[PDB]
């Protein structure tokens, strides 16, 4: 028959392997000819696989590239202005790729140009709390200094924002072996660790969901009216550049001034990790000089959009999307994901050629310019927002399929928890020691829920991937899944030249069994979402998490009992709303199970109630100063785009509140955010009441 | 049978008459006990009439009232500070009501307190062009002056905003007989004209759609967090008070300074209409002094919400709403409308008691605090916005049923033009000379379309009534209809104490036949919208008007050919989008007529495409500095809230552009607005394409 088992059985590890190899032989940098050619290949193949239509959707967006004839680098300069040490111009290419052209050298995308010269301050991970420690406790002033920060813990854009607000005149980012060199494993090509010449690329924007910096709100189409650079969204004001740990050792070894405040500031290099400012006595007249000459340029990008029309509800869309652009070869990021999408499309197309169609429409997307700020997905969603918010059932992301070989990692809306539990109980575990056991069993054993015995950990969605527009702007139920390691600082070869097909085939997944498991999870979710008669969402799971999040935010506020008394700060309305949501969801669930199953209008009313429940958490006014983060329950952390924050409006109103000069105003804003949250939870609850 | 004819035949003129009398014996001022009692009566009666549920929805909103022991008035003061002339403390009450208590004296709701003293400047209607003439041509400076303006032409809130920006320190509004005294008709009680002691009440806010000044975006519920007065939306900064023409004559007769610039500045009083500043020689040391002591106060209001659940699509709402609060007796405004709603509810309830239900759910609303800024409807819509934007089919307004006895007046979305033409062809004309002819025929004869022979005039929706939140904020197809006069300056007794039951019964509609015709139009529209299998919207009518509006806005821009050349200002994208909309709408219409009629999912997809088409013109970012005006095609005029403006974003970008100091910036913003409009029209068109 044509059921989920038939779909799942058609997926093959060997096909994923072939596609991965096919997608990783040359670089596919956004805006380059090679990535346009790959888009055309994928379009052709998806048509051959049997999709009903496959189109390219293009946009002209702001991208950033080094200058090929004026390379970026950092120096130590002596008192005469002689450059006595220079950082590398490129990563040593891996074996057999030493003649591959168009490898973009390491750079921080969207850095402005400049040649700032100054004294170094070491700022640990450049987190908000690292800057609090420097200014408030250590009394070190970063104003007019070049700061050097280790990658890790938080999104690099947040590091740069934090350095800017501290008054830094430039930022040097580096990979410390503490964070990117696993003990006991060899450097690439003999293992999966970062060599000392390896460097992590990546953008340093602070877009807060806007998409293309020049066209916030609207697609960057042929007639778009663009902001000037000075009014663009999210661009950094100071130069930034990334280096490897051989080069970092040379910049850090001479550092003087104050000692590190404790061991959480020390990485693994043989240097003191002194904070500065500047170098020790003998070298005190030497300085550090950056040379950044990259340019921002409006450049065409191409999304591939494939459609498999639904047989019964063609006006309901289930979306499987992931990006295609890579920094270099994209062996893990994104092609391990893209190869999985390709095999999922192939399997659905096999069923379609035998006469099957899903109940609802499935859309497949190969996004461009993700690496430059989620630009392809965001512009497309901006173009199609009306269609998406009235018809969008769900979005399943499909970036990297693997970041390790230990167990499953799932982040998603509470509406999908039951779907994920049920699906993983029907899938085979690929893990050694769990032969003949379910994926649910292996996952639950290796990654136990911190709340509930006998359940696996599922995390809330953060950001830094292409679901952002769909979930946090538009309120479409979203999820993601991949294979991960044991225990936000990525795998060692992340965004480096060393992330190749061979990395994956030799060290991560030689049999492609973890890739296949991830294909089954992502594809199985899509199948259920697109074919189940009743949408596979459980509103009661939202009720449970809303109480947890309400308890959490109340607990934060209750660190300030005197102020809560003075300003009459009550969470009673939020708990009331959460109680009401719990009650109404329970009653809706009863009707969903008991409704007349012959009546397709009651079913669709029910299905629309389910689809629009995630939508109900959207506030059209957005969060404060972040108009494109509209979901009231979930936003990316203001301190780390990768991490999700719950009740973000209240959280940010409470953050560091003891430091605000006007407590009356600050606690007034806490109360305002409690009102907005309680109202939104109640309003979402009421969408599940009987309709009339 | 149970069809529209049965519904229409049940409506009775004599019932409307009885309800009107019942609703107009005492004042029903928002926030007063008498208006709460009327709300409870209507709730009880709607339940008895047969609605499924009838609830009160209350909110606590900012209202404004005079101080009963510290009355508002204006003086002429001589050089010693003696008050030699005082304006009236109240309107002479009409016959038989001279002992009625709680008649609110004339005042401008939301005026701040103050006692400003100064020289008068007469500013005609206080329109934007009147202030342009004073400053730019006549070189008269209103800074620190008290301005005196005649009511008429534009919403009084716009007059006050314009006076404030001119630097006025107070505003006196008056009714000139040129605008409020029809030649040949007697003053009330012997005819329908305004007596010299009559005064027009009304609010002077500039809310731009916000609702309650203290809670923009969110309902003013029990736990709402309120702005402080200083941050409230829309409040005037200078005192304002309204007077009648006996009192105005006393203030105007001594005016000196400059002569009126032409005859369009002269009303009908026996005064010169000199502009000032100040009085002529003998009286030059005299001044005008206002005394305003009204207070703003958070006050409970009550909407009545009745539900008639749909038999087939109970999750689709057709709304019939109008306000209940009045300034005094509300003989026309609003009770002529409320009485019509009451009889419509009664007629639907009669059918329901015989076993009928409409296909879709009908909601009936008696709104409160309309007179204080559309507060009741707006707060309710804020509370229920998620339900409304996913389920709202249409909103039919029901304020005053009559403002004259000449012919029909209809303002509505283009989506309802065909519905209105078809319905009025099936209704009998009530007009003398058209016995046995259709309402369509009489209306078309008396109010010909300026574009098309053999069609009647239908206008675009402006604002100043309770449809605003539904149409311009939420994008729900809306309409209104009433009987009107031959040829924005209301009927003479508007918002005066003289607007009584007797006014209506003696002078406007003694047989209640015009009321009955309006009940048939409003009720018939609701019936069709709630019962037609395919929603009765024609998307092709939107295509026709979008071309008209595009031609209009292009024509405005083409008054500046040199600038369009310099800044490369093209409307090509907007015309392209309109062409595309026209083509796609034509194809959708073919499918709507040709689709398989047995398939309820294709029908609902079609019905959802129809319902969401008005929704597609909404921009979640709003218009510039007016976040609650979100419709890109239609907004209230920035110069006159009562008037609708098409392509408002482009219109306001072009307005007075020749006066802007930075033409590059100004024309850049024109181009931005063209892009937003072209994009929105294309996006709306694409919602009518095949869905997959
Ligand atoms: C969780 O869900 C529950 C419902 O089970 C909601 O309960 C409502 O809670 C509010 C309190 O926040 C109640 O509001 C009160 O309404 C009274 C009038 O209620 C009657 O009339 C209304 C219509 O006008 C009907 O809908 C209702 O059924 C009743 O018949 C007011 O008189 C109250 O105001 C008085 O007391 C307050 C507080 O002391 C004073 O501030 C006022 O000045 C005034 O003296 C009050 O407004 C409401 O009745 C409850 N509805 C119910 C039980 O159906 C919760 O609100 C909801 N949680 C959230 C966060 O929404
Ligand atoms: C009204 O509806 C029509 C459709 O009937 C829309 O037409 C589109 O118009 C735009 C122009 O604004 C066209 O854009 C052009 O696309 C070319 C590529 O098209 C092919 O590939 C795409 C996918 O990538 C397919 O969708 C398409 O079917 C074609 O196969 C580009 O090469 C063009 O760019 C080049 O020329 C321009 C202008 O000189 C330069 O600025 C560029 O730098 C570049 O050299 C251009 O982008 C689009 O193809 C049309 N689609 C069609 C016919 O299907 C109208 O846009 C629409 N009106 C509005 C307001 O939306
Ligand atoms: C994940 O899997 C779980 C476990 O299967 C699943 O929960 C189960 O869902 C079914 C179907 O809704 C539940 O069965 C219902 O239970 C009630 C009470 O026993 C019955 O009244 C229902 O009967 C009606 O519907 C039947 C068809 O479903 C008709 O045959 C019948 O005539 C009635 O109309 C029905 O049997 C079952 O109770 C739960 N089990 C739980 C919660 O433990 C869950 O839904 C899955 N999650 C997702 C997202 O799919
Ligand atoms: C206002 O009134 C006008 C005038 O009645 C009305 O326009 C008419 O609508 C009908 C119904 O859509 C149109 O009739 C259709 O015309 C085409 C071509 O002739 C036919 O193919 C259609 O046949 C299909 O549908 C029928 C049922 O409607 C089935 O019986 C049949 O098997 C087919 O499936 C159908 O007859 C008619 O052409 C227009 N007339 C015009 C435009 O002059 C208009 O819709 C009304 N407006 C509103 C808002 O209700
Ligand atoms: O501009 C942006 O917003 C991000 C662009 C780019 N995005 C990424 O590289 N994202 C990777 C980096 C991983 C970061 C992370 O903290 N992931 C957490 C996570 C949790 C559960 C999963 F299933 C998958 C990932 C990713 O999402 O795979 C970047 O950070 O440079
Ligand atoms: O605060 C506000 O936005 C308005 C409150 C109040 N609103 C009204 O009194 N509105 C009346 C005044 C009539 C103004 C007008 O220009 N009406 C035009 C019009 C056109 C077609 C119709 F079917 C009905 C009215 C009404 O809409 O009936 C007011 O102006 O003081
Ligand atoms: C990746 O696979 C594609 C598809 O098999 C290859 O592209 C095809 O190459 C052959 C031989 O040059 C052509 O005849 C076909 O027209 C191509 N088909 C397409 C683009 O759909 C491509 O060569 C492979 N790339 C690598 C690096 O192996
Ligand atoms: C990239 O760097 C090159 C080399 O410095 C820039 O090309 C030079 O530009 C200047 C004027 O801007 C000319 O006078 C030189 O003759 C050019 N040099 C060479 C070797 O061609 C180029 O402008 C930069 N590219 C950018 C900014 O995109
Ligand atoms: C670091 O790189 C710089 C730039 O290439 C080198 O400095 C240049 O050296 C050449 C030849 O000696 C001079 O003609 C240039 O004027 C220098 N340019 C600048 C900007 O200083 C420098 O020698 C390199 N340092 C090391 C240690 O390799
Ligand atoms: C308006 O009509 C209502 C309804 O007929 C009248 O209210 C009723 O009055 C009688 C006699 O006092 C009471 O017994 C009923 O309980 C009332 N019914 C309600 C409120 O539903 C009211 O008297 C009329 N008002 C005027 C001014 O005539
Ligand atoms: C309305 O006006 C009255 C009368 O002027 C105000 O009442 C007076 O208030 C002052 C102090 O604010 C007292 O000292 C007087 O004795 C009061 N006079 C009387 C006659 O009671 C009243 O405050 C005003 N109401 C408002 C602002 O709502
Ligand atoms: C206009 O009204 C004011 C206020 O009532 C009158 O002025 C008051 O007159 C009484 C009695 O003569 C004095 O005790 C008060 O001091 C006056 N108050 C003020 C504020 O001036 C005035 O007489 C009235 N003018 C006319 C022409 O009737
Ligand atoms: C940091 O240094 C600059 C002066 O170079 C100064 O403007 C700023 O206020 C300093 N902050 C301190 C010392 O806290
Ligand atoms: C694969 O799993 C083995 C066994 O647990 C482990 O030793 C190895 O480090 C893993 N490889 C990667 C790349 O994580
Ligand atoms: C209007 O009058 C005031 C001075 O009383 C002044 O501030 C303002 O600039 C004047 N404008 C003119 C004369 O245009
Ligand atoms: C009613 O109609 C008659 C006849 O046209 C007209 O003379 C009279 O002024 C109308 N009454 C009102 C209040 O408009
Ligand atoms: Ca954009
Ligand atoms: Ca509000
Ligand atoms: Cl992912
Ligand atoms: Cl109306
Ligand atoms: Zn990626
Ligand atoms: Zn990446
Ligand atoms: Zn009214
Ligand atoms: Zn009114």
Swiss-Prot record, chains A, B:
Details of cofactor binding: Binds 2 Zn(2+) ions per subunit. Required for NAALADase activity.
Gene3D superfamilies membership: 3.50.30.30, Transferrin receptor-like, dimerisation domain, Zn peptidases
CDD domains for the chain: M28_PSMA_like, PA_GCPII_like
Positions annotated to bind Ca(2+): 215, 218, 379, 382
Effect on the protein upon substituting residue 333 to E/L: Complete loss of activity
Phenotype for residue 422 to A: Loss of glycosylation. Reduces enzyme activity
Residues that coordinate or bind Zn(2+) 1: 323, 333, 399
Effect seen on changing residue 582 to A: Abolishes enzyme activity
Result of changing residue 333 to N: No effect on enzyme activity
Residues with glycosylation annotation: 22, 67, 86, 99, 141, 282, 405, 422, 580
Free-text activity regulation comment from the record: The NAALADase activity is inhibited by beta-NAAG, quisqualic acid, 2-(phosphonomethyl) pentanedioic acid (PMPA) and EDTA. Activated by cobalt.
Positions that bind substrate: 156, 203, 370, 463-465, 480-482, 494-495, 641-642
Extracellular-side segments: 1-692
PANTHER family: GLUTAMATE CARBOXYPEPTIDASE 2, N-ACETYLATED-ALPHA-LINKED ACIDIC DIPEPTIDASE
Function, in words: Has both folate hydrolase and N-acetylated-alpha-linked-acidic dipeptidase (NAALADase) activity. Has a preference for tri-alpha-glutamate peptides. In the intestine, required for the uptake of folate. In the brain, modulates excitatory neurotransmission through the hydrolysis of the neuropeptide, N-aceylaspartylglutamate (NAAG), thereby releasing glutamate. Involved in prostate tumor progression.
Protein name, as recorded: Glutamate carboxypeptidase 2
